[PDB]
Design a protein around this ligand. Structure first.
Ligand SMILES: [Mg+2]
Length: 495
C-alpha cells in the first residue's frame, strides 16, 4: 500500500527542465500519499559519465526543497542507490532470465552490425535486430549449438538480448496516456546485458524497481516506446510490474517541436536549474538560480507545465501542491514552455518578499557595481522599487538615479518639460527632507504660484533622473538627500 517512487537520472550532465518536472511530480505524488521518494543514480554507462553530475542533482534538489528519503547521500534499506555498485544483484537476475525463453546470447561485433546497417540504408530502410533479422546474424538462436559452445570456450565476447515474441499483442495501460496496444513485431531484441556483464538501463531499471519495491514509475515519454519491453521483462522474471505514468515532452515556446537549449539560447532564458560548465568547451550555462529566479517561483512554474489544480489557483506553495497534487489530473497533451510565465511567477513571489528578505541579494548586486549605501536607505529603495521588479537586480539596474547623478538629459523629455521656479523650489526645500513634507512643500509652492503640480514635478523629475522615469519625485529626493537634490537641480539649470 505504501507508495514508492524514484527519480532515476543518469550522471551524464545537468538536469533539464523536463527532469526537474519529473522529480517534482515524483516528490508531490509520494508526499501526497505519505510515501517514499528515492533517488537512484543511473551510472552504469561509464563512458557517458560527467564528473560532478550526482553532486549537481543533489544540489538542485536541495535548492528546490525536494530531498530524497533514500539516496546515496542518505542511505536507505535498499542500498546501494548507485547502479554501478549493484553488479552482484544484476548477476543473480542475469542467471535467472537466461533460464527462460525470453533471452539469448549474441556475438555480433560492431563491424558486423555496421555492415547490416549499411545494407538496410542502401535499400532506404533502417536495420532493427528483431524476429525478422535474428536468424541471419550471429547469436544462440541462429548458430548451431556446437558453434555456440565453441565460441564460449574461446571466451568470445557476447551480449544478452531480449527475445521479442512472434506476433504478440501487448495491452498497455498508462496513468497519463491511457490504454493502448502494441504488436511485438514492431519491437526489437534489445540488449539487456553488455559485453562486460553490466545491464543496460532497460534491464537494470526493472531489476531495481522490483528490488526497491517501487509502486509507480513516473517518467518522460521518451521511454514510452520501451514500455512494452519493460512489461515483458517483468513477465519474464515472474514479477508484477509497477504502474507507469509517461509525461509528455515540454513543447517549444513558439512553433512546432519540443523545448531545447536552442530555444533558451535564441530567446534568452536559462535551461538548467544551476550553473553548468561544459567540460569539453569550458563554457558555462547560467542556471535559473544564478539568473535570480526564486526557487519557490521556479518550482511553481515547473509544476504548472501540464498540471492545473482543480481550484484554478496559480500561486501555490510546496505544501499546497503536496496537498492537492493528483497524478490523474496531469495532462496528456504537451505543455508549451513560457518565458513570460516564468518571469511573471518570479515577479509575483518577489513582490511578496519582505524588504529585509531582499536586502542580502540587493547588497550583493550593489557591491558588484561598486556602490555602497546604508542599510536604512537600501531597505527604503527596495520598498519603492520591488513592485515593478522581476528580479532583485532590476532594483539597481532600473534605479541607477538613486546612486548616480544624470550626466545628460533626454531631448524629448527636455522639450516636454523654467529656472526661476526651480530656484524658488531650492530655497523652500531647506527643511526636514521627508517625502511627505517635501511633497507638502511642493504643493505649497504650486498653490502659492499659479501652476499645476506637474509644472514643478516634471522638470524636477528630469533634473534628478535625466529622463521621465523613476518613483515619485519626493521619494527620490528623500533618498538622494538635500545636498544631492540641489546639486542635480543646479546642474539641470546650468544645462
Ligand atoms: Mg489516466
Amino acid at each position: 500500500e505504501k507508495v514508492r517512487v524514484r527519480f532515476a537520472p543518469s550522471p551524464t550532465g545537468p538536469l533539464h527542465l523536463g527532469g526537474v518536472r519529473t522529480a517534482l511530480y515524483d516528490y508531490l505524488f509520494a508526499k501526497h500519499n505519505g510515501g517514499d521518494f528515492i533517488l537512484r543514480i543511473e551510472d552504469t554507462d561509464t563512458q557517458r559519465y560527467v564528473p560532478g553530475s550526482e553532486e549537481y542533482i543533489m544540489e538542485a534538489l536541495e535548492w528546490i526543497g525536494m530531498v530524497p528519503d533514500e539516496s546515496p547521500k542518505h542511505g536507505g534499506p535498499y542500498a546501494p542507490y548507485r547502479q554501478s555498485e549493484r553488479r552482484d544483484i544484476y548477476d543473480r537476475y542475469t542467471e535467472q532470465i537466461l533460464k527462460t525463453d525470453y533471452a539469448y546470447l549474441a556475438f555480433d561485433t560492431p563491424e558486423e552490425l555496421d555492415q547490416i546497417r549499411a545494407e538496410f540504408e542502401a535499400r532506404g530502410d533502417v536495420f532493427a535486430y528483431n524476429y525478422e533479422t535474428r536468424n541471419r546474424l550471429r547469436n544462440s538462436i541462429s548458430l548451431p549449438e556446437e558453434e555456440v559452445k565453441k565460441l564460449l570456450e574461446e571466451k568470445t565476447p557476447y551480449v544478452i538480448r531480449f527475445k521479442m515474441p512472434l506476433d504478440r499483442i501487448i495491452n498497455l495501460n498508462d496513468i497519463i496516456r491511457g490504454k493502448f496496444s502494441v504488436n511485438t513485431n514492431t519491437l526489437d531484441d534489445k540488449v539487456l546485458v553488455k559485453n562486460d556483464g553490466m545491464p543496460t538501463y532497460h534491464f537494470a531499471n526493472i531489476i531495481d524497481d522490483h528490488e526497491m519495491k517501487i509502486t509507480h514509475v513516473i517518467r518522460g515519454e521518451e521511454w514510452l516506446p520501451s514500455m512494452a519491453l519493460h512489461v515483458l521483462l517483468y513477465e519474464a522474471m515472474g514479477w508484477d510490474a509497477p504502474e507507469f505514468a509517461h509525461l509528455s515532452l515540454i513543447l517549444k515556446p513558439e512553433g512546432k517541436g519540443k523545448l531545447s537549449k536552442r530555444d533558451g539560447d535564441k530567446f534568452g532564458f536559462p535551461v538548467f536549474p544551476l550553473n553548468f560548465t561544459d567540460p569539453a568547451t569550458g563554457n558555462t550555462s547560467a542556471g535559473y538560480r544564478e539568473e535570480g529566479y526564486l526557487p519557490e517561483a521556479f518550482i511553481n512554474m515547473v509544476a504548472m507545465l501540464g498540471w492545473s489544480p482543480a481550484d484554478n489557483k496559480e500561486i501555490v506553495s510546496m505544501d499546497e501542491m503536496i496537498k492537492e497534487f493528483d497524478l490523474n489530473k496531469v495532462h496528456k497533451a504537451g505543455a508549451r514552455f513560457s518565458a513570460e510565465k516564468a518571469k511573471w511567477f518570479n515577479q509575483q513571489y518577489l513582490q511578496l518578499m519582505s524588504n529585509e528578505a531582499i536586502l542580502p541579494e540587493f547588497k550583493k548586486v550593489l557591491a558588484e557595481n561598486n556602490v555602497e549605501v546604508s542599510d536604512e536607505k537600501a531597505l527604503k529603495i527596495i520598498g519603492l522599487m520591488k513592485e515593478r521588479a522581476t528580479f532583485v537586480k532590476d532594483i539597481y539596474n532600473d534605479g541607477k538615479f538613486f546612486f548616480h547623478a544624470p550626466e545628460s538629459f533626454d531631448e524629448k523629455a527636455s522639450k516636454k518639460a523654467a529656472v526661476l521656479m526651480q530656484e524658488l523650489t531650492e530655497a523652500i526645500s531647506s527643511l526636514d527632507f521627508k517625502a511627505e513634507i517635501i511633497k507638502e512643500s511642493i504643493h505649497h509652492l504650486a498653490e502659492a504660484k499659479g501652476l499645476g503640480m506637474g509644472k514643478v514635478m516634471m522638470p524636477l523629475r528630469l533634473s534628478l533622473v535625466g529622463e521621465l522615469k523613476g518613483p515619485d519625485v519626493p521619494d527620490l529626493m528623500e533618498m538622494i538627500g538635500k545636498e544631492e537634490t540641489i546639486s542635480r537641480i543646479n546642474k539641470a539649470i546650468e544645462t
